[PDB]
Design a binder for this molecule. Structure first.
Ligand code: ZJ4
Ligand code: ZN
Ligand code: ZN
Length: 257
């Protein structure tokens, strides 16, 4: 069975969220593969199907539960289960399509969306950009209910799309970046719901390019600079892995050590 990590919005604390994101990172990778002091996710090539996914079970005050499936090779959400129904994003290729048949195998009802799970597609379906979608314990609670009620026709597609953007950022992007984990920790600490600032959105957008730049670096110096944003939206370039060691927690595997 794929490992299950449990999180609840009911009485969530800085501590419970900290333990959650550290457990997710611990199941995503062994941390045996480190490049320039940043851990690498397992190589898809050589990864047995029985190690391909982890399950994150989310519960809220209404004691509704949904289970997200994360791909350990990129930490991205590929689908979810709510009771007797499972839903999957459109796989990019045949290997990925066959992989998702190994998820939620006992579920009565299985559905694959025609659309992909990327931010550009989900923002379009939601009718809202990430910069206008609030994150925090309240938004996650509402997302869990929206995901749960999709199968009974209680959630419209735009609301589902928005709920996916919330879950992806507070789980996948938080696992990928200590910096985004810290943004979610602050929102919990101060009982705040608020949209992510440009620093967060640009890091999300740049994760694949940063993984490549770090792994292809000449002893930590980037072959080419990467442009990121500060909280105030001002742009700056990174030339070196060292400045990112407090920012990025996980990278997608790009090449052999
Ligand atoms: C120091 C760094 C390196 C790489 C990427 C980012 C987003 C950052 C920032 C941390 C705090 C910032 C601020 O207060 O605007 S920016
Ligand atoms: Zn409560
Ligand atoms: Zn190095």
């Amino acid at each position: 069975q794929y490992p299950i990590i449990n999180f609840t919005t009911a009485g969530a604390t800085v501590q419970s969220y900290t333990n959650f994101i550290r457990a997710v990172r611990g199941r995503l990778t062994t941390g045996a593969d480190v490049r320039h002091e940043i851990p690498v996710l397992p190589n898809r090539v050589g990864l047995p199907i029985n190690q391909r996914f982890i399950l994150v079970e989310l519960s809220n005050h209404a004691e509704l539960s949904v289970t997200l499936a994360l791909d350990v090779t990129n930490a991205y959400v590929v689908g979810y289960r709510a009771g007797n129904s499972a839903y999957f994003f459109h796989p990019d290729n045949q290997e990925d399509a066959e992989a998702i048949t190994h998820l939620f195998t006992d579920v009565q009802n299985r559905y694959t969306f025609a659309f992909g799970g990327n931010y550009d597609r989900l923002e379009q379906l939601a009718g809202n950009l990430r910069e206008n979608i609030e994150l925090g314990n309240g938004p996650l609670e509402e997302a869990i209910s929206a995901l749960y009620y999709y199968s009974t026709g209680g959630t419209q597609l735009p609301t589902l799309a928005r709920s996916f953007i919330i879950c992806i950022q507070m789980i996948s992007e938080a696992a990928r970046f200590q910096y985004i984990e810290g943004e979610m920790r602050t929102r919990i600490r101060y009982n705040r719901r608020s949209a992510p600032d440009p620093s967060v959105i640009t890091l999300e957008n740049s994760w694949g390019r940063l993984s490549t730049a770090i792994q292809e670096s000449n002893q930590g110096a980037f072959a080419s600079p990467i442009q990121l944003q500060r909280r105030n939206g001002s742009k700056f370039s990174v030339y070196d892995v060292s400045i990112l060691i407090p920012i990025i927690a996980l990278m997608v595997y790009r090449c052999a050590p």
